[PDB]
Design a protein around this nucleic acid. Structure first.
Ligand SMILES: [Zn+2]
Ligand SMILES: [Zn+2]
Lengths: 539, 49, 50, 128, 522
DNA sequence: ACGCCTTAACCAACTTGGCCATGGAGTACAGAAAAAGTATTACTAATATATGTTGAA
DNA sequence: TTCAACATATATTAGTAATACTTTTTCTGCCAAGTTGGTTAAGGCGT
């Protein structure tokens, strides 16, 4: 009662609740509903919009839509209708504003290439580069440099030049790029069933797998098409060095951002289990390999089709050797002089690899120094949870759940046997843990059909649920925090109009640091929560 | 409790359901004011209507 | 209230009611099943009708 | 043992010697004062106590009898689950460098909330 | 409460005439309301013992065939009794029996305590005392006062016989009433005079029955009755009245209970006298009761019966006592000299025979006194008046209990005029409360006066100072027979021997459970 | 060629509200311990019934 | 027979002080239709 928490603003809205405020926190206005309604109901048509939103028809419809396009906030499909002409139905990009939802953290992705110029105007340069990019999202050095002054050495005003390529940075949006993945797989599922030279009408398996093969291997060069394209990378005009292709607009490259932050986690978790010497070694080693590892990207194909209880493994096996061998060529065998702050003899000092043991790494070419990879990242992921509940709720929940890990569907005696303290606490910690997810429940009929108190009560992990509940977390501040940010705007909104155009009153002076360092608390507090959220949303 | 099995613990889906249950006889079937009831007796010299 | 004794009121049953519909009398329903039956005004809200 | 307490006592007692079992003593005075490449090649160190604890338990200074290596392993199992130690190759064991707990950031300790007045907090059940 | 909107009449008249059943005031003609909207057709230690308490309550209640309604009175009383923690300390049958008795008494019904109680094993004096306690613990007044006028009916119903009994009943009642008038009634069980007039007017109606039959409903003895039978035979104009005409005598004669006639058996101004003064004396060292009990003229040691040493002395004819901790209670003390001086004598055996145990903390726990006014007084009304500060029940005890708050003393009352004032720790309070209530004493009389001075004799502290207050003054007041009150070692090896031959099982169980201590360990 | 398993249509099992209207009186398991409060267990020490018995006339 | 007389109880205030005793107080062990499953028939599918 009395709105102070306001469960309305909160409790009843899964998932999209983030989105519709993000775009709101971005635009709102006309642009708010279309994404909200979209993610709500799913597939939607232009004509189909205004029969729901009442959204200023076929203007803000068109306007907001092309807005999202420019910023690639939607997934975008068109095809002929079944009678003819052409029809356009729409989805929402990835997590979309997910791009925006990092931003300053994507700004931190620069801090990898903060190197080679440290604390320079070059820093501010690449800064305005990136955010100008990300505000529009697709630009050319022809368009950008065009807007930029043409009196500052071309190969310097825009100093990031060859550095435009690297791993992250930009890739031209093409066709499939923001096109919905789940279907465009089905689009490739054509031309194989669709091209059958009336071969034999038996065993669709021979039709399927082969089509699958095609569907597989065709899709590969499909997604490998953005992975690298030389016409960008290669161009070296006369009396010049190698440049990108200034012609086509390129767009933020999200992959190496994923792999980068996931790295940062591994710096933390590994850093937890090893020493800062061995740690920083692992840290600088990963700086090379984070180039090559998809690490969130592999799903792709898994997303968009039913597995098969065998063929699921027929995907898993591909992930077993993939990075381990062929990208293993790109991976650690002998690396030389990474940084050093240590000094003097660097060799057995570099044999500190073998100090890696558990629960990860520590697999090499039996006498070259190498870390397992495409096998590593997967069983690494499974471990990543660990600490996630301790002062989350209670210390004792750890050991039991951890124990609940090793054993499975046991019961309280065998708990209290294995466990310690008192049933007075054991129930509490357990019960206060069962209040959401974790343990779930198991029970079996005891000398009855099914009855209330007869049977036995058992406990289970099911990280499927667990790893899939931490979105409730997303529903906490990533839900809320954005509001009390926005809600605090209308507080100073009057002053916000004036105070922004000024560069007056004592309370103004006070509430400056209040609302502002307040914004430090919210935004920083967010990114705090984000570093945690960086996992269960993807792997 | 009791526990000699008092039959009509039921209060609700019932009160909305059948016969005297509202949504037929107590709502569409309202028992309406301004009326009167008596027995009959013939009056031929009274006109029809 | 119910029947004779305590005090009056008389029974329009459904089977009794619908006989009026065969004559299709609009208002006779209202005066009968409404204005003389339970006289009430609900106050509501266009937005989120309640 | 017995169904009541002061196992936690004898636990945190054995945890001490367990911390000794791995590298030299705490050296937590300043930040990096560990084994310094773990003496020579921690690969050479494959170590644990198990039965030894009983020879270690000889100290007593407490009211109890001895206890079987089986139930010794049971005592080990909690700090496995509490993650104070590590279980490698059965009877071999490690420390989780717990000590950094005993003494951006993702550790629960070494973290304190503001948690007064301001509405900007993260509780857990801000949605239940 | 509601008022018209226009005429603002404060009175509303309901019209049920035409069966509009409306409400309107004779001041306006503008109705108050339309169609008055009418209707139609856990587990706690307390609450559970209220379940069981209703079970017991009702069950045992109408085992008497008492009215159901009346039971709920006690149910509140019982519940009320739960509030003051009067309930827990003793048996339940006491409780429910009490609270029902306070109902029926307060409600003036026909049932009897000795009777009602008799539903059990009970001595009936027990639950009587239980009822007596809640008189303290709850706070009540003159409410529970009855007469045979009721109980003759319930008795008359039980004897069957013929309907002339009713005619007899009318004959009996006024009969007893004149007997109530002639003042032989109070101070005795009303059932006695009840069955008395039964045998009298049934005798007047000449139907031959037995005293067994009478006391059968009366639940008293027979000789008990005939004491009251011939106790009528001697009364005023008894044989002059006892003949026919249904005793139209309304007259009195005198009113002279035999009470003060037994005062004639030895035949303010009369001063109440000291009897005993209850006190205590602290020694200051705890010691072995048997070790001192070894050599004495007057002592007994049997912790089996009670744990203490029985101590008494023929001079100055005082008892007192000893405790184990080095404490004692002074008893049998008629005055303070004889009290404190003998109280010192007890330390003389001690420092002489046993340990040191000096004489400390001599403090009066109570003082007893008694008096008589030599004439009858009416308690029935006195209680009816002062039953606020007074308590009496007819069969619970013959004398009347008075309670004075200022000062705080219980007063023992008799129509003989004999009054026992006791419960005070101070001498002067005796005559303070005594002469204080004396205006009530002479106030109630039927058809001396000088208190002299309110304080005449010296105070308590005077006689207290007349005896050595220093614990180490002992040999000074030694009678020199206390030198002889010790006994030889032979009579200890013989007396004490007999004690051991008797108590070797008592001490045997002591030391045996003391061995269970060793067994307790294992 | 021939057999195998997989998918799916059928059919027999268990399944559930209906059941004139109007009146018109008529209508929580049993067992334990811990706490706590009182009775007894001696004494005055004074009652006057009440009772018992026995016993002496 | 009637006395009679004698003893017991009895209500208070003290007590200790101790044991013993009950409580309270937790605190616990009749038809149409869906519904299933049990059957079969086809049908790939590999032999
Ligand atoms: Zn509304
Ligand atoms: Zn009026």
């Amino acid at each position: 009662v009395m709105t102070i928490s306001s469960l309305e603003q909160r409790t009843l809205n899964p998932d999209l609740f983030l989105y519709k405020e993000l775009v709101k926190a971005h635009l709102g206005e006309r642009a708010a509903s279309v994404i909200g309604m979209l993610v709500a109901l799913g597939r939607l048509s232009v004509r189909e919009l205004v029969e729901k939103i009442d959204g200023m028809d076929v203007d803000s419809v068109k306007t907001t839509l092309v807005s999202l396009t420019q910023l690639r906030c939607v997934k975008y499909l068109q095809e002929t209708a079944i009678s003819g002409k052409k029809t356009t139905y729409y989805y929402y990009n990835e997590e979309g504003i997910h791009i925006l939802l990092y931003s300053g953290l994507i700004i931190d992705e620069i801090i990898t290439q903060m190197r080679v110029n440290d604390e320079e105007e070059h820093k501010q340069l690449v800064a305005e580069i990136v955010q100008n990019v990300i505000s529009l999202g697709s630009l050319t050095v022809e368009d950008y440099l065009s807007s930029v002054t043409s009196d500052s050495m071309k190969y310097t005003i825009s100093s990031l030049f060859v550095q435009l390529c690297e791993m992250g940075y930009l890739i031209q949006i093409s066709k499939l790029h923001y096109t919905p993945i789940e279907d465009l797989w089905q689009f490739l599922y054509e031309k194989h069933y669709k091209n059958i030279p009336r071969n034999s009408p038996l065993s669709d398996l021979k039709k399927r797998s082969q089509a699958k093969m095609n569907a597989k291997t065709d899709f590969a060069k499909i997604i490998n098409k953005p992975n690298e394209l030389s016409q960008i990378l290669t161009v070296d005009p006369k009396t010049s060095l190698r440049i990108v292709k200034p012609t086509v607009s390129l767009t933020i490259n999200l992959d190496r951002f994923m792999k980068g932050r996931r790295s940062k986690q591994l710096i933390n978790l590994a850093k937890t289990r090893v020493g800062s010497v061995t740690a920083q070694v692992y840290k600088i080693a990963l700086r090379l390999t984070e180039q090559k590892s998809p690490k969130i990207r592999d799903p792709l194909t898994q997303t968009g089709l039913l597995q098969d209880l065998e063929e699921a493994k027929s995907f898993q096996d591909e992930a077993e050797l993939v990075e381990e061998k062929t990208p293993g060529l790109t991976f650690n065998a002998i690396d030389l002089a990474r940084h050093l702050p240590s000094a003097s003899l660097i060799n057995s000092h570099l044999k500190i690899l073998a100090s890696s043991n558990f629960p990860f790494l520590n697999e090499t070419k039996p006498g070259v120094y190498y870390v397992p990879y495409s096998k590593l990242m997967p069983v690494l992921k499974s471990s990543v949870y660990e600490y996630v509940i301790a002062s989350t709720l209670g210390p004792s929940a750890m050991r039991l759940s951890r124990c609940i890990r090793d054993n499975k569907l046991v019961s309280e005696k065998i708990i209290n046997s294995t466990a310690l303290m008192k049933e007075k606490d054991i129930r509490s910690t357990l019960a206060s843990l069962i209040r959401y997810n974790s343990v779930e429940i198991q029970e079996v009929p005891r000398t009855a059909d099914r009855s209330a108190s007869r049977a036995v009560f058992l406990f289970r992990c099911k990280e499927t649920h667990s790893y899939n509940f931490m979105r409730q977390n997303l529903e906490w501040n990533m839900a809320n925090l954005l509001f009390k940010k926005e809600k605090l705007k209308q507080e100073n909104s009057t002053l916000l109009k004036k105070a922004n155009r000024d560069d007056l009153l004592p309370s103004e002076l006070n509430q400056l640091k209040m609302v502002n360092e307040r914004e430090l608390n919210v935004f920083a507090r967010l990114s705090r929560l984000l570093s945690l959220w960086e996992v269960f949303q993807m792997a | 409790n009791g526990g000699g099995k008092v039959k009509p613990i039921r209060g609700f889906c019932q009160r909305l359901k059948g016969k005297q249950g509202r949504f037929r006889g107590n709502l569409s079937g309202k028992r309406v004011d301004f009326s009167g009831r008596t027995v009959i007796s013939p009056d031929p010299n009274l006109s029809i209507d | 209230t119910e029947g004779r004794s305590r005090d009056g009121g008389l029974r329009l049953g459904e089977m009794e009611r619908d006989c009026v519909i065969a004559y299709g009398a609009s208002q006779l329903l209202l005066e009968r099943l409404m204005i003389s039956s339970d006289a009430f005004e609900v106050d509501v809200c266009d937005k989120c009708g309640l | 043992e017995l169904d009541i307490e002061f196992i936690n006592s004898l636990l945190t007692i054995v945890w001490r010697f367990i911390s000794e079992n791995t590298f030299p003593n705490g050296f937590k005075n300043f930040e990096n004062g560990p084994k310094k490449n773990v003496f020579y090649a921690p690969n050479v160190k494959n170590y644990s106590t198990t039965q030894e604890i009983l020879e270690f338990i000889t100290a007593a200074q407490v009211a109890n009898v001895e206890l079987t290596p089986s139930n010794i392993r049971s005592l080990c199992e909690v700090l496995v689950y509490d993650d104070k130690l590590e279980k490698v190759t059965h009877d071999c064991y490690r420390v989780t460098l717990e000590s950094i707990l005993q003494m951006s950031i993702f550790n629960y300790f070494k973290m304190f909330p503001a948690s007064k007045h301001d509405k900007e907090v993260v509780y857990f059940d801000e949605w239940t | 409460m509601p008022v018209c909107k226009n005429c603002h009449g404060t009175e509303f008249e309901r019209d049920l005439s035409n069966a509009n059943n409306d409400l309107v005031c004779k001041a306006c003609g503008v109705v108050s309301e339309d169609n008055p909207i009418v209707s139609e057709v856990a587990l706690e230690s307390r609450e559970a013992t209220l379940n069981n308490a209703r079970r017991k309550l009702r069950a045992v209640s109408y085992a008497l065939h008492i009215p159901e309604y009346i039971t709920d009175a006690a149910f509140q009383w019982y519940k009320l009794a739960l509030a003051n923690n009067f309930v827990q300390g003793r048996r339940s049958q006491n409780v429910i029996a009490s609270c029902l008795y306070v109902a029926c008494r307060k409600e003036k019904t026909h049932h009897m305590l000795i009777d009602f109680s008799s539903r059990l094993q009970v001595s009936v004096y027990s639950i009587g005392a239980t009822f007596l306690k809640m008189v303290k613990k709850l706070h009540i007044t003159e409410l529970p006062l009855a007469d045979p006028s009721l109980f003759i009916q319930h008795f008359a119903e039980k004897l069957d016989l013929a309907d002339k009994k009713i005619k007899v009943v009318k004959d009996a009642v006024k009969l007893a009433q004149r007997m109530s008038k002639d003042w032989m009634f109070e101070g005795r069980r009303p059932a006695g005079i009840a069955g008395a007039c039964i045998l009298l007017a049934c005798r007047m109606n000449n139907l031959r029955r037995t005293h067994t039959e009478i006391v059968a409903v009366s639940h008293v003895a027979e000789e008990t009755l005939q004491q009251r039978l011939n106790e009528f035979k001697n009364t005023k104009a008894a044989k002059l009245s006892v003949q026919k005409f249904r005793e139209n005598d309304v007259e009195d004669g005198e009113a002279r209970p035999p009470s003060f006639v037994k005062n004639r058996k030895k035949e303010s101004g009369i001063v109440p006298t000291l009897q005993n003064i209850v006190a205590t004396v602290t020694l200051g060292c705890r010691l072995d009761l048997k070790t001192v009990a070894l050599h004495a003229r007057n002592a007994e040691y049997n912790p089996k019966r009670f744990a203490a040493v029985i101590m008494r002395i023929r001079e100055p004819k005082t008892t007192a006592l000893i405790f184990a901790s080095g404490k004692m209670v002074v008893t049998g003390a008629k005055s303070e000299d004889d009290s404190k001086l003998a109280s010192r004598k007890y330390a003389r055996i001690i420092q002489k025979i046993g340990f040191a145990a000096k004489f400390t903390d001599f403090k009066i726990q109570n003082i007893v006194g008694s008096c008589d006014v030599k004439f009858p007084i009416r308690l029935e009304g006195l209680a009816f008046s002062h039953g606020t500060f007074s308590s009496y029940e007819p069969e619970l005890f013959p004398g009347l209990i008075y309670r004075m708050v200022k000062p705080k003393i219980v007063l023992l009352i008799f129509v003989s005029g004999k009054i026992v004032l006791t419960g005070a720790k101070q001498r002067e309070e005796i005559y303070q409360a005594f002469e204080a209530i004396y205006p009530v004493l002479s106030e109630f009389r039927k058809m001396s006066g000088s208190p002299r001075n309110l304080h005449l004799l010296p105070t308590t502290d005077t006689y207290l100072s007349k005896v050595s207050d220093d614990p180490d003054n002992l040999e000074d007041v030694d009678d020199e027979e206390l030198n002889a009150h010790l006994l030889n070692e032979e009579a200890s090896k013989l007396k004490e021997r007999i004690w051991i031959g008797l108590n070797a099982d008592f001490l045997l169980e002591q030391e045996s459970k003391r061995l269970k201590q060793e067994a307790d360990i294992a």
